[PDB]
């Protein structure tokens, strides 16, 4: 037997959670139990605390999503049939190059600009929410600073590199296949993004995060029979499970982590993926305009 | 440098990253050395000076616990340095052979750490691993089979005992241990759930790590409705020893 | 030497082959028979790469490249100076990866733990084998394997992707990318959560798994728990790699080489629900 | 000792070891003489 | 020189030496076979 | 026999067999690499 | 200078020295084989 | 107390070590003389 | 790796192989009927 | 003003100050080096 | 605290200052030689 | 000024200072080597 | 100056110094070998 | 006392200094020969 | 009685039936509306 699923699932009362500091509001009281969630993990589906920052984040995000969707519906003459047919190919396209960094007409990038503004405000409000939800329980803010890296890549893609290029037209559209095409044409227009070194580093850290999380999940499942999944307790009071995990990796590759430093490895790999990504994007066009030429100049 | 120069902003930024990343690898490899150091030199090595490695272990780190208590890592008291083992050969890197009974010595796959002999208190300052008779409000969710009543059988097909109670973790609703009334000595021993196939293959629950009689030797918990971290390691280690040392003559 | 707690575990037994001949450690590393075999394969491969580079124009680390055989050799053994070195480096690499997984199995047995790590590594091994063995065999010549070069296998990825129009429209490829991005997200979340509980705000005690459950609830909406997170992470990474392998198997053996992945999607646009 | 061999056993093993090493070297030498008779290496600066 | 066997166990040292020697022989044979002058199977490229 | 005071043959034989088989496979593949000795 | 063996384990030092010397010799041989003037197998065009 | 050995062991190992190192260096010197006879290195700034 | 015993594995494998065999026999009868329609070997 | 060291421990304050000052100095030096007028190594007109 | 007595501190600091000063002297000689080889700091019109 | 060694462990401080000095020297050498005026190996061309 | 060995383990400091010296030596050798002027194997045309 | 005694430190340091000096003088001979082979430090116009 | 309701709680095995019936009616209406003959809004093309 291996711990991919739980053989016997016990069920009891709903947990209200840890009491908060005197700076928040009463949270929701949904606290329902889904059977399959408990099959693969825990079963409770609440209660989601949704305070001021969460509600304003959802409001701004749905303003942005409404703008995008209404523009995709208008671009198809309001036909729901043609909307379902063309959905993955529809997008709110960025402003035209002739407008630079001004506020263009609504049908030529004004709607795109407003949706991008509101999506950025939504994402910043969600970041503030993560920060407060961590520091309202007395925890560190490591999750918030991991989220800030993804936010930095998103800002570089949509805001910073368009700024430094002097045109909103550089930014992605709001659509599935159209933003894939934007990615492709961005690589094609700026040389070949395989010769962007920070792109190489971001790919190294993405592959390494996949590798590391496979390694770590497999390691914890392998020593779960010795209580390995209780990582905090195994760090505060080292048991035989984390000793066996450390010894597995030390005998395999010569070096190991502890119960806490493995999560520093994880955090740093996952964070360095979008950090190096954002650097490589900010460099692409304002600094280097042809990456293959740069690579030839170096190697 | 200037537009025509060989040096440019992209590669300067790349070297800045390489420096930062070498520093970060050093810092991470240094954090990795908060347990298990200094190294224990093996046969033929001078033991006067400590072996640490090129990132030396950092200073001991002090964690604050809930009840104002305090834990400093490395947990050197958990090491169990001297055990019942003898080198199979005089040269370095040689494996060790258990001198006595590896189930009782706690060596090899049967090793445990000298954890604190106190249960985990979770959040309300109460043991989190408790029998279901002691955690009112929880229930086995009859959607799955019920282990209680099923007599537990060894690896060699000998019945070992009968499942009496299911021990669960509070605040992480999960079954951790099955209590087992041993065969005919009126003694209750814990059985970790991952070491058991609670599926009712035929009629019962089967453990292939040890054989039927060995359930008498499982380390028993001192209290009756709570289990300490030390007993947890001892029980899981007694069951892990069978993965290498039992092989109950099933050939 | 040993970690301060390691001596308990350095016991004899648990190997697959060879008995106690290789049942020993060299410093930190356990050897076993498969450790000797892995170092043998890795070193023969590295020496063949070095020799192929000595025959080549440059020693530049970025421009080193061991190229697969010409398409004229099909699925046969090519002369050593005309692609055979690539085939032999591939054989050495697959041997090294397999004996590495087996050495991990031996270590798992000696420590008495599950075999999740060698099983998970087998997925990366399978993706590599798909790339260098399965796909070029299905397509009929070793010339479809990627060259062993730091920046020439990137050129191979580029050319292979662009040979199918835009590779982004490969559906299994979209699923694989979703899985990779979710794996990175979940790794950041898990690392940050455990680091938040262990290293809390100033003056605070080390937090418990209950706080972790609470904050995970407030972020993702529900809770998976301490074992659920590691299960989900293993599953996400493994499915990312599996769908990458599927992605590569379906492009060239299934969709023709000069095909178009963007055009394959017209089956949806051309449904009779909305086509005419 | 570190290996666990008494100097008697070490000397005994070393005798057979040097005997085998020297037989190996002699076989390698005749192999290299034959190989040279088939293809000499070490060309001139202009080539063979 | 016999003292070298007070340091290294002869079984494992001997097996490791054999693995090393076989790998070196394999590499030198490959290197010869990859050249044109010392390809004893097909001869020169001509 | 002196080699059999080391390397007890109950395990130093299957290793020799897999080594001989691997060497035979290597030489056959090297032969198939060439044109003069590719017997297919 | 014999005092160095009061610092370092002469056994581990011997193995490290062997590994390092072999790695260096292989590196130098491959460097020479990559040149044209000092390639001793095929000759002066490489 | 020292990092492992005694001055007797250290001196014995050092004697054997220096002998082996000297003969290794002598073989290397003969090798380099032969290599130079075959192909001198260090060309003039114009070439060979 | 997937929590499942050797009894379940063996019985599910028996089921899997008999299902595979039935699939293949229906496949070959479908092929011979198609040949009745179109012999694909001129 | 000495009371500032009742808020921030001098050790962290000092290491962060040093890394910040060195980063600023490096940035300014490279900014100057990128110009034509203030490039002191290769000089102007580039 | 670094776990160092003020006697140890003053000792280490004196040796450190001596070493830092010798390093500075060597670097100054190096820069004088480098300037004799190639002066930097051109005029605004170039070298 | 000797009091700085009460703030920082002289071992860690000294290792860090040496790493920093060597890295800075390497960087300055490579910068000079990348220029045309101060390349002392191949020269101005 | 001898007091620096009351701080740093001489074995570890010495193997660090040897690793660093070997790395610096091979780096300088490779740099010279990559230039045309100071290449001593093929010669000045490189 | 981070491992050693006063006497061991002094002995190690004497041996370290003498062997560092031997390394330095061998390297100086090496550089004199290298300069005899091909001088570096060209003029601002080349060699 | 039919115990498919016992396997499938009508609280969920009836809302899924309804979402499926709605999807099917939408699909059929869309198909008819896409044809030229059966379009009842801008009915016949050409
Ligand atoms: C011709 C000139 C003159 C010639 C000589 C003339 C005279 C001849 C006669 C006399 C001389 C001859 C005899 C000399 C005998 C010497 C014996 C000896 O030194 O034995 C040592 C010793 C003997 O055994 P022992 O007595 O038990 O040792 C006790 C010691 O106290 C060790 O205690 P510890 O265990 O506490 O310390 C361990 C420490 C020992 O090492 C250290 O203290 C430092 C190690 C890390 C150094 C990092 C780099 C620093 C410098 C950077 C500059 C470039 C580096 C190289 C770059 C190459 C490419 C350009 O190593 C580590 O902590 C692990 C390092 C892990 C590295 C992982 C990454 C490797 C690969 C990276 C690339 C891929 O054995 C070893 O140290 C074994 C390990 C050796 C390798 C170390 C790591 C190598 C790192 C490579 C570079 C990586 C970064 C790039
Ligand atoms: C390309 C050609 C090949 C190059 C290979 C690399 C060359 C440089 C390293 C050479 C080392 C030679 C050592 C010879 C034996 C010395 C005598 C001896 O055994 O004494 C006991 C000595 C130390 O015993 P100990 O004192 O008890 O160990 C605890 C430490 O002292 C203190 O504890 P700790 O926790 O601080 O450190 C434990 C751990 C330190 O951690 C590691 O060992 C980490 C090793 C991997 C580091 C990551 C490498 C990533 C490279 C990425 C490069 C990307 C570039 C391109 C990017 C685009 O191990 C060590 O202490 C160092 C062991 C050797 C490290 C290097 C192993 C091969 C790496 C190949 C790459 O043990 C060893 O040195 C281990 C020997 C076995 C490993 C060497 C053979 C590996 C063969 C690999 C083949 C395939 C390569 C690909
Ligand atoms: C370069 C070459 C030389 C260096 C080579 C070596 C590099 C590596 C060294 C070892 C690093 C070790 C490590 O990671 O320790 C983690 C470790 C984490 O904490 P812990 O020890 O586990 O436990 C702490 C407690 O649990 C209490 O925890 P907590 O509640 O305080 O929260 C802990 C949390 C945080 O710990 C902190 O210290 C951070 C918060 C500090 C207080 C609040 C200040 C807010 C300032 C906001 C500024 C925004 C931009 C930030 C840019 C940062 C980088 C410049 O820890 C972390 O997040 C880990 C550190 C890494 C953070 C990465 C942030 C990525 C940001 C991505 C872009 C975001 C864009 C904006 C998005 C905004 C939202 C939409 O320690 C630290 O984080 C302390 C170091 C913090 C460094 C801050 C930056 C210093 C450098 C400034 C720039 C200097 C250069 C340029 C100068 C100016 C030129 C003009
Ligand atoms: C212009 C170029 C000239 C030249 C000009 C110079 C000048 C100038 C100098 C040298 C110096 C050296 N030259 Mg020269 N040299 C040339 C050509 C060569 C060639 C060659 C194949 O052509 C070789 C092999 C050498 C070799 C050497 C060394 C003897 C010496 C380097 C110092 C040193 O070893 O520090 C390393 C010292 C150590 C103690 C390192 C010890 C390593 C220990 C054992 C542990 C390392 C562990 C290791 C990382 C493990 C992995 C190993 C890998 C598997 C390889 N030169 C050409 C002709 N040479 C230097 C010298 O003489 O210094 C005294 C010097 O100043
Ligand atoms: C032809 C295509 C080009 C290419 C063009 C690009 C471009 C352009 C970029 C990348 C980027 C990346 N590429 Mg690429 N890339 C290529 C080939 C590859 C290959 C391969 C095997 O060949 C791989 C593995 C990769 C992988 C990668 C990643 C390492 C990196 C993305 C980091 C990341 O995690 O973003 C995931 C994180 C984000 C996208 C930001 C997070 C978004 C925010 C925080 C979340 C908001 C959600 C929102 C609230 C939800 C509601 C919104 C509304 C519905 C709208 N590329 C080729 C060469 N690639 C990116 C990069 O950083 O490179 C420098 C990038 O910009
Ligand atoms: C370490 C880098 C990786 C990372 C990290 C990361 N992301 C994060 C976090 C962290 C640490 C959070 O804490 C935060 C969070 O809440 O996670 C649960 C988050 C988050 N990352 C998210 C998405 C996300 N992350 C991505 C990538 C990455 N995140 C990196 C690979 C991507 C990609 C690859 O495109 C996406 C789409 C959200 C789930 C969440 C931030 C939510 C937010 O800002 O909400 C704003 C509110 C609205 C816009 C209103 C509507 C909300 C819904 C539209 C939410 C739908 C979520 C998801 C299903 C969207 C998927 C894409 C859609 C187009 C379908
Ligand atoms: C004064 C100004 C200057 C200040 C503003 C300055 C701002 C700071 C600008 C910043 C903008 C930047 C940052 C944006 C970056 C762009 C992103 C990188 C987008 C890339 C990827 C986007 C797609 C993958 C997602 C598109 C959404 C989806 C396809 C459609 C959803 C809409 C419908 C379905 C809703 C159904 C709803 C219906 C209509 C039914 O009701
Ligand atoms: C939120 C993230 C952090 C905040 C933002 C970070 C950036 C803040 C500073 C931005 C400074 C402005 O940056 C400066 O932008 C201007 C116009 O926008 C660019 O100016 C030029 O850009 C390009 C150059 O081909 C052309 O469009 C045009 O000639 C001109 O606009 C500069 O090249 C860039 O250096
Ligand atoms: C004791 C050990 C004995 C080892 C004996 C060695 C057995 C032979 C090893 C198998 C070698 C087969 O070698 C190779 O096989 C493939 C697979 O069909 C043959 O067939 C291939 O032909 C052409 C190219 O040649 C391909 O385009 C085609 O798709 C494929 O059919 C190759 O033409 C042949 O060169
Ligand atoms: Fe974890």
Residue numbers in the entry:
A (entry chain M): 4 to 302
B (entry chain H): 1 to 251
C (entry chain L): 2 to 277
D (entry chain D), H (entry chain F): 5 to 52
E (entry chain C), G (entry chain E), J (entry chain N), M (entry chain G), O (entry chain 1): 1 to 46
F (entry chain A): 2 to 41
I (entry chain 6): 6 to 47
K (entry chain K), N (entry chain I): 6 to 52
What do the paper's sentences say?
The reaction-center light-harvesting complex 1 (RC-LH1) is the core photosynthetic component in purple phototrophic bacteria. The basic unit of photosynthesis in purple phototrophic bacteria consists of a type 2 RC surrounded by light-harvesting complex 1 (LH1), forming the RC-LH1 core complex. LH1 is formed from curved arrays of αβ heterodimers, each of which binds two bacteriochlorophyll (BChl) a molecules and one or two carotenoids.
Protein-W is largely hydrophobic with the transmembrane surface formed by TMH2 and TMH3 interacting with LH1 αβ-14. Along with the loss of four BChls and two carotenoids due to the absence of two αβ heterodimers, no carotenoid binds to the distorted αβ-1 subunit, resulting in an LH114-W ring containing 13 carotenoids and 28 BChls. As quinone diffusion through the membrane is expected to be faster than diffusion through narrow protein channels, the open LH114-W ring may permit faster RC turnover than the closed LH116 ring, in which quinone access to the RC may be more diffusion limited. We suggest that the absence of a structurally resolved UQ at the RC QB site of RC-LH114-W is likely a consequence of a more disordered and more active complex and that the QB site in RC-LH114-W has been frozen instantaneously in a conformation that reflects this activity, in a particular phase of UQ turnover where the entrance to the QB site has closed. Further, major conformational changes are apparent, notably the shifting of helix de (a short helix in the loop between TMHs D and E) on which L-Phe217 resides into the QB binding pocket and a rotation of L-Tyr223, breaking the hydrogen bond to the backbone of M-Asp45 and closing the entrance of the QB binding site.
